[PDB]
Scaffold this active site. Structure first.
Site, PDB file in Angstrom:
ATOM      1  N   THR A 162      31.149  35.506  39.889  1.00 23.89           N
ATOM      2  CA  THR A 162      30.750  36.851  40.353  1.00 23.89           C
ATOM      3  C   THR A 162      31.570  37.896  40.677  1.00 23.89           C
ATOM      4  O   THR A 162      31.724  39.010  40.477  1.00 23.89           O
ATOM      5  CB  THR A 162      29.405  37.057  41.279  1.00 23.89           C
ATOM      6  OG1 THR A 162      29.778  36.227  42.509  1.00 23.89           O
ATOM      7  CG2 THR A 162      28.101  36.403  40.620  1.00 23.89           C
ATOM      8  N   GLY A 163      32.586  37.441  41.437  1.00 24.20           N
ATOM      9  CA  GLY A 163      33.978  38.003  41.823  1.00 24.20           C
ATOM     10  C   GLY A 163      34.829  38.611  40.936  1.00 24.20           C
ATOM     11  O   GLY A 163      34.771  38.580  40.193  1.00 24.20           O
ATOM     12  N   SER A 196      27.704  32.104  45.548  1.00 25.65           N
ATOM     13  CA  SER A 196      27.000  31.749  46.784  1.00 25.65           C
ATOM     14  C   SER A 196      25.334  31.425  46.567  1.00 25.65           C
ATOM     15  O   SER A 196      24.840  31.835  45.514  1.00 25.65           O
ATOM     16  CB  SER A 196      27.210  32.926  47.483  1.00 25.65           C
ATOM     17  OG  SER A 196      26.384  34.010  47.385  1.00 25.65           O
ATOM     18  N   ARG A 228      23.163  33.312  47.997  1.00 22.66           N
ATOM     19  CA  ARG A 228      22.509  34.485  47.453  1.00 22.66           C
ATOM     20  C   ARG A 228      22.531  34.813  46.157  1.00 22.66           C
ATOM     21  O   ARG A 228      21.334  35.286  45.525  1.00 22.66           O
ATOM     22  CB  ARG A 228      23.198  35.534  48.105  1.00 22.66           C
ATOM     23  CG  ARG A 228      22.859  36.213  49.381  1.00 22.66           C
ATOM     24  CD  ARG A 228      22.189  37.491  49.377  1.00 22.66           C
ATOM     25  NE  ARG A 228      20.976  37.440  48.857  1.00 22.66           N
ATOM     26  CZ  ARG A 228      19.995  38.213  48.354  1.00 22.66           C
ATOM     27  NH1 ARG A 228      20.290  39.114  48.237  1.00 22.66           N
ATOM     28  NH2 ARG A 228      18.754  37.713  48.275  1.00 22.66           N
ATOM     29  N   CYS A 252      49.521  36.118  41.684  1.00 26.20           N
ATOM     30  CA  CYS A 252      49.781  37.133  40.611  1.00 26.20           C
ATOM     31  C   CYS A 252      51.011  37.626  40.590  1.00 26.20           C
ATOM     32  O   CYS A 252      51.718  37.842  39.397  1.00 26.20           O
ATOM     33  CB  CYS A 252      48.853  38.275  40.571  1.00 26.20           C
ATOM     34  SG  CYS A 252      48.494  38.881  42.125  1.00 26.20           S
ATOM     35  N   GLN A 282      51.299  47.176  43.881  1.00 29.49           N
ATOM     36  CA  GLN A 282      50.356  46.273  43.345  1.00 29.49           C
ATOM     37  C   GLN A 282      49.009  47.039  43.372  1.00 29.49           C
ATOM     38  O   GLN A 282      48.537  47.822  44.286  1.00 29.49           O
ATOM     39  CB  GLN A 282      50.191  45.171  44.180  1.00 29.49           C
ATOM     40  CG  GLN A 282      51.462  44.186  44.168  1.00 29.49           C
ATOM     41  CD  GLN A 282      51.242  42.911  45.042  1.00 29.49           C
ATOM     42  OE1 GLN A 282      52.269  42.305  45.970  1.00 29.49           O
ATOM     43  NE2 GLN A 282      50.156  42.278  45.018  1.00 29.49           N
ATOM     44  N   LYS A 323      54.136  34.356  50.039  1.00 30.26           N
ATOM     45  CA  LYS A 323      53.849  33.505  48.635  1.00 30.26           C
ATOM     46  C   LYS A 323      55.067  33.807  47.374  1.00 30.26           C
ATOM     47  O   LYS A 323      55.182  32.542  46.924  1.00 30.26           O
ATOM     48  CB  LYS A 323      52.248  34.223  48.318  1.00 30.26           C
ATOM     49  CG  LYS A 323      51.488  33.369  49.137  1.00 30.26           C
ATOM     50  CD  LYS A 323      50.019  34.284  48.494  1.00 30.26           C
ATOM     51  CE  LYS A 323      48.994  33.817  49.386  1.00 30.26           C
ATOM     52  NZ  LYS A 323      47.770  34.683  49.078  1.00 30.26           N
ATOM     53  N   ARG A 338      50.641  48.116  48.362  1.00 31.92           N
ATOM     54  CA  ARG A 338      49.658  48.351  47.565  1.00 31.92           C
ATOM     55  C   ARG A 338      49.432  50.109  47.147  1.00 31.92           C
ATOM     56  O   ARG A 338      49.778  50.805  47.920  1.00 31.92           O
ATOM     57  CB  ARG A 338      48.456  48.008  48.547  1.00 31.92           C
ATOM     58  CG  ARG A 338      46.880  48.196  47.925  1.00 31.92           C
ATOM     59  CD  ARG A 338      46.333  46.782  48.163  1.00 31.92           C
ATOM     60  NE  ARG A 338      46.216  45.956  47.013  1.00 31.92           N
ATOM     61  CZ  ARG A 338      46.162  44.462  47.224  1.00 31.92           C
ATOM     62  NH1 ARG A 338      45.843  44.050  48.151  1.00 31.92           N
ATOM     63  NH2 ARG A 338      46.371  43.838  46.220  1.00 31.92           N
ATOM     64  N   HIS A 387      50.164  45.157  38.119  1.00 30.90           N
ATOM     65  CA  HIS A 387      51.258  45.061  39.162  1.00 30.90           C
ATOM     66  C   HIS A 387      52.635  45.379  38.748  1.00 30.90           C
ATOM     67  O   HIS A 387      52.919  44.859  37.523  1.00 30.90           O
ATOM     68  CB  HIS A 387      51.182  43.581  39.920  1.00 30.90           C
ATOM     69  CG  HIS A 387      50.108  43.404  40.685  1.00 30.90           C
ATOM     70  ND1 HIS A 387      49.719  42.126  41.180  1.00 30.90           N
ATOM     71  CD2 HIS A 387      48.927  44.096  41.060  1.00 30.90           C
ATOM     72  CE1 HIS A 387      48.600  42.033  42.051  1.00 30.90           C
ATOM     73  NE2 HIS A 387      48.202  43.351  41.933  1.00 30.90           N
ATOM     74  N   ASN A 442      47.129  41.956  36.589  1.00 30.35           N
ATOM     75  CA  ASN A 442      47.175  40.881  37.908  1.00 30.35           C
ATOM     76  C   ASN A 442      45.868  40.156  37.784  1.00 30.35           C
ATOM     77  O   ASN A 442      46.158  39.055  38.595  1.00 30.35           O
ATOM     78  CB  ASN A 442      46.942  41.888  38.890  1.00 30.35           C
ATOM     79  CG  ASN A 442      45.924  42.810  39.042  1.00 30.35           C
ATOM     80  OD1 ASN A 442      45.993  43.775  38.184  1.00 30.35           O
ATOM     81  ND2 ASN A 442      45.373  42.863  40.210  1.00 30.35           N
TER      82      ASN A 442
HETATM   83  N1  LIG Z   1      41.405  40.017  41.364  1.00 32.94           N
HETATM   84  C1  LIG Z   1      42.406  39.327  40.850  1.00 32.94           C
HETATM   85  O1  LIG Z   1      43.158  39.735  40.244  1.00 32.94           O
HETATM   86  C2  LIG Z   1      42.618  38.203  42.020  1.00 32.94           C
HETATM   87  C3  LIG Z   1      43.762  37.625  41.727  1.00 32.94           C
HETATM   88  C4  LIG Z   1      44.176  36.590  42.622  1.00 32.94           C
HETATM   89  C5  LIG Z   1      43.196  36.234  43.399  1.00 32.94           C
HETATM   90  N2  LIG Z   1      41.874  36.843  43.735  1.00 32.94           N
HETATM   91  C6  LIG Z   1      41.210  36.387  44.837  1.00 32.94           C
HETATM   92  O2  LIG Z   1      39.749  36.896  44.789  1.00 32.94           O
HETATM   93  C7  LIG Z   1      39.313  37.130  46.196  1.00 32.94           C
HETATM   94  C8  LIG Z   1      38.854  38.602  46.263  1.00 32.94           C
HETATM   95  O3  LIG Z   1      38.009  38.940  45.128  1.00 32.94           O
HETATM   96  P1  LIG Z   1      36.592  38.644  45.007  1.00 32.94           P
HETATM   97  O4  LIG Z   1      35.689  39.964  44.658  1.00 32.94           O
HETATM   98  O5  LIG Z   1      36.444  37.680  44.032  1.00 32.94           O
HETATM   99  O6  LIG Z   1      35.971  37.841  46.542  1.00 32.94           O
HETATM  100  P2  LIG Z   1      34.434  37.389  46.678  1.00 32.94           P
HETATM  101  O7  LIG Z   1      33.507  38.794  46.727  1.00 32.94           O
HETATM  102  O8  LIG Z   1      34.268  36.758  47.761  1.00 32.94           O
HETATM  103  O9  LIG Z   1      33.945  36.609  45.243  1.00 32.94           O
HETATM  104  C9  LIG Z   1      34.479  35.205  45.274  1.00 32.94           C
HETATM  105  C10 LIG Z   1      33.211  34.228  45.066  1.00 32.94           C
HETATM  106  O10 LIG Z   1      33.128  33.733  46.585  1.00 32.94           O
HETATM  107  C11 LIG Z   1      31.923  34.505  47.249  1.00 32.94           C
HETATM  108  N3  LIG Z   1      31.362  33.363  47.957  1.00 32.94           N
HETATM  109  C12 LIG Z   1      30.803  33.519  49.214  1.00 32.94           C
HETATM  110  N4  LIG Z   1      29.998  32.672  49.883  1.00 32.94           N
HETATM  111  C13 LIG Z   1      30.295  31.614  48.913  1.00 32.94           C
HETATM  112  C14 LIG Z   1      29.717  30.144  48.743  1.00 32.94           C
HETATM  113  N5  LIG Z   1      29.156  29.782  49.921  1.00 32.94           N
HETATM  114  N6  LIG Z   1      30.102  29.584  47.636  1.00 32.94           N
HETATM  115  C15 LIG Z   1      30.623  30.251  46.545  1.00 32.94           C
HETATM  116  N7  LIG Z   1      31.053  31.269  46.614  1.00 32.94           N
HETATM  117  C16 LIG Z   1      30.722  32.217  47.726  1.00 32.94           C
HETATM  118  C17 LIG Z   1      31.064  35.147  46.178  1.00 32.94           C
HETATM  119  O11 LIG Z   1      29.935  34.663  45.557  1.00 32.94           O
HETATM  120  P3  LIG Z   1      28.804  35.649  45.841  1.00 32.94           P
HETATM  121  O12 LIG Z   1      29.264  36.682  44.906  1.00 32.94           O
HETATM  122  O13 LIG Z   1      27.327  35.062  45.272  1.00 32.94           O
HETATM  123  O14 LIG Z   1      28.511  36.176  47.332  1.00 32.94           O
HETATM  124  C18 LIG Z   1      32.206  35.245  44.705  1.00 32.94           C
HETATM  125  O15 LIG Z   1      31.404  34.422  43.695  1.00 32.94           O
HETATM  126  C19 LIG Z   1      40.725  36.784  47.062  1.00 32.94           C
HETATM  127  O16 LIG Z   1      40.143  35.843  48.049  1.00 32.94           O
HETATM  128  C20 LIG Z   1      41.525  36.278  46.265  1.00 32.94           C
HETATM  129  O17 LIG Z   1      42.144  35.045  46.721  1.00 32.94           O
HETATM  130  C21 LIG Z   1      41.676  37.872  42.941  1.00 32.94           C
END
Ligand SMILES: NC(=O)c1ccc[n+]([C@@H]2O[C@H](COP(=O)([O-])OP(=O)(O)OC[C@H]3O[C@H](n4cnc5c(N)ncnc54)[C@H](OP(=O)(O)O)[C@@H]3O)[C@@H](O)[C@H]2O)c1
Ligand SMILES: NC(=O)c1ccc[n+]([C@@H]2O[C@H](COP(=O)([O-])OP(=O)(O)OC[C@H]3O[C@H](n4cnc5c(N)ncnc54)[C@H](OP(=O)(O)O)[C@H]3O)[C@@H](O)[C@H]2O)c1
Lengths: 348, 348
Positions: free
Chosen positions: B11-12, B36, B38, B151, B178, B207, B237, B244, B327
């Site tokens: 979902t993220g 999650s 949720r 990235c 970025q 990193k 940022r 990026h 990215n």
């Molecule tokens: N966008 C990019 O280009 C990019 C590039 C590299 C890395 N990232 C990574 O993505 C993260 C930030 O973006 P995001 O919006 O994806 O973060 P996020 O909103 O936390 O989404 C990632 C997943 O983790 C959440 N989560 C929370 N509790 C959980 C559980 N118990 N089990 C499984 N999932 C759980 C969300 O689930 P729910 O939605 O169901 O709560 C979601 O599916 C950073 O930490 C980074 O490492 C993103």
């Protein structure tokens, strides 16, 4: 009483900052505002498309804009003229004003690299104003042209100066993230920076790589002997209104720790006792992990302080850090105003 | 081909790019979507706050999100599982999936620097996939954890690789600008980048300075011997959604001209003619004076090409240039999808 001053290119981006600085000034009285033929004849409020977040100073609103003509009757009694002209118009008009005996303080690039023209930041190379004696002899006028540097260059050079004095300089890398305001109201289109950036600003890297060497050079036998350290710049335009941010990587001659670099910058204050109206502490050190930020820090010292943060060890060179400058105050209008304030106190 | 795949953290921000890539894929069929508790039980369209400029693929909209549990019924016929989990959750769940005999293709930073975990860009260090055999010995599971890099690191490393092969590497300076989409939908607040920028992204420089050395290192005796060139990053940022941009300054071992650097990058194409679905030319050279630009160029190769422009002489090192990466595609989701495509086509 006050020394009567004028502004060339008063309606543009830099001109508006000149106007803000000079509307209520303890040494200077703003009596003349010049622009193009279109603007000439109108009240400043009408001729200028004002885009500052503070309103036009009340005493300037109804001041009638005059043509850019050194022998115009409104220029007769003005002694100091601040120039915000485009470079090509500066080549034409600035010598004309100098021949009329007027002191020109210019942000235009036109005369910066002329050997008899001072390219000055008062904290860095005030002694280069000695070139005006030489200029008057070779040019045959009793006025003067004094230039301030390119905005990106000023930011870097102020931070590099105290480092060079203590530890020397070998090599400097700079990557800039530059605001849009200096390009003028119709300079950077919205679609250039909306969900976008431009990895290019024409001539900006060349200016940084050359103007820096003159600023940090040595006046010797009537000429500035360029500094010998190496400098490489990469310039970028981003979605920021005011405030240029620079990632700077520095190799010194003697080697230096981050704490030592921080110390020399913090203690750097050559103008503190000079009673200059536009004075500010040259370098303000931020200890926060994510500072400086343009919006939070560009008003530091009313736009006259360079703000430095994240001073840390470099894996390759000695030190890396982030520097912020208000590109339009310290980087331009404020640079020339401080130049003029210093000039009347210490020179003639 | 319809090899059944799952997505962790579907979902993220990265999860959504996984979904876009896997919804209509000629090798993989998306059958499990984990998030999650949720989100568990909901249709993907309801559980996910979708923020891509293209609508959710129709076939995925009504697909029911399941809990992050490797024992789940929907994971039975699934061997390849993609991970978009945050690091702390990856440390918990990814070993659980490996223990169930599943191959984890992960964007999480958690296991990247483990000596028995492949940190792979297929164009660069595909041979590092062999580390899974050492991993199975040490950890005692029959699955594996295979990671793609940060990235920012990917963008730089792709450009540095053909340069290192031909001319070697001594030192690299990088300054990044970025985009925000990586931090997630609720990652970068509007006031961090509205008429502003942040000269700091937590752990990003670290990193870039560490992951690069593993990626460009040499596999020997079941271990990666880290590359020995020096690297210094400054990360920032900016107000960009996707893409990026990096200002890179390179010192080679043998010495090189800009045209030579341009040539090795343009010829760099190790994965051609393998019919990898997510293939794109690794490096696309722009000849324009002000390219690449994030908005104009990030879609290049459907987000999988690194776009490089302004290759020119450096006054200090050998060459400087600007590199652009999408990215979330090349930088994250596409990076792992490509890893998995290469895995079935080359590794098994
Ligand atoms: N966008 C990019 O280009 C990019 C590039 C590299 C890395 N990232 C990574 O993505 C993260 C930030 O973006 P995001 O919006 O994806 O973060 P996020 O909103 O936390 O989404 C990632 C997943 O983790 C959440 N989560 C929370 N509790 C959980 C559980 N118990 N089990 C499984 N999932 C759980 C969300 O689930 P729910 O939605 O169901 O709560 C979601 O599916 C950073 O930490 C980074 O490492 C993103
Ligand atoms: N603000 C800063 O911090 C900063 C820093 C560095 C450099 N700059 C410089 O400022 C420039 C861009 O700003 P801008 O919007 O001020 O440009 P601009 O408006 O074209 O330049 C200032 C002046 O030139 C114009 N002009 C056109 N024809 C003229 C003529 N025949 N005589 C006199 N003036 C004429 C304007 O007059 P009208 O308004 O009457 O047309 C007047 O505002 C760049 O060239 C750059 O070098 C600014």
């Amino acid at each position: 009483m006050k020394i009567k001053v004028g502004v060339l290119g008063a309606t543009g981006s830099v001109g508006q900052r000149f106007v803000q600085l000079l509307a209520d000034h303890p040494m200077f009285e703003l009596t003349a505002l010049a622009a193009s033929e279109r603007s000439a004849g109108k009240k400043y409020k009408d001729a200028c498309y004002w885009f500052q977040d503070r309103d036009i100073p009340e005493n300037i609103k109804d001041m009638v804009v005059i043509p850019t003509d050194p022998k115009h009757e409104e220029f007769e009694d003005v002694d100091i003229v601040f120039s915000a002209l485009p470079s090509d118009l500066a080549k034409k008009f600035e010598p004309e004003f100098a021949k009329e005996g007027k002191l020109i303080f210019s942000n235009a690039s036109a005369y910066r690299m002329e050997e008899d023209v001072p390219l000055v930041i008062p904290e860095v190379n005030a002694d280069h104003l000695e070139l005006i004696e030489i200029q008057r002899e070779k040019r045959g006028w009793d006025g003067a042209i004094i230039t301030n540097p390119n905005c990106s260059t000023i930011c870097a050079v102020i931070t590099l100066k105290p480092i060079m004095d203590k530890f020397g300089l070998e090599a400097v890398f700079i990557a800039t993230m530059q605001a849009v305001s200096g390009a003028g109201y119709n300079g950077v289109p919205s679609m250039a920076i909306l969900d976008n950036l431009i990895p290019f600003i024409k001539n900006e890297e060349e200016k940084m790589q050359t103007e820096s060497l003159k600023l940090l050079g040595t006046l010797k036998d009537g000429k500035v002997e360029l500094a010998n350290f190496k400098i490489s710049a990469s310039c970028n335009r981003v979605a920021v209104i005011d405030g240029h941010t620079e990632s700077i990587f520095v190799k010194t001659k003697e080697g230096a720790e981050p704490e030592e670099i921080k110390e020399v910058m913090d203690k750097f204050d050559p103008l503190k006792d000079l009673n200059l109206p536009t004075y500010a502490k040259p370098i303000v050190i931020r200890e926060e992990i994510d500072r400086p930020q343009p919006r939070l820090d560009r008003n530091e010292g009313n736009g006259m302080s360079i703000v430095v943060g994240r001073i840390r060890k470099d894996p390759i060179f000695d030190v890396k850090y982030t520097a912020l400058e208000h590109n339009t105050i310290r980087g331009a209008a404020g640079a020339s105003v401080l130049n003029a304030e210093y000039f009347v106190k210490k020179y003639i």
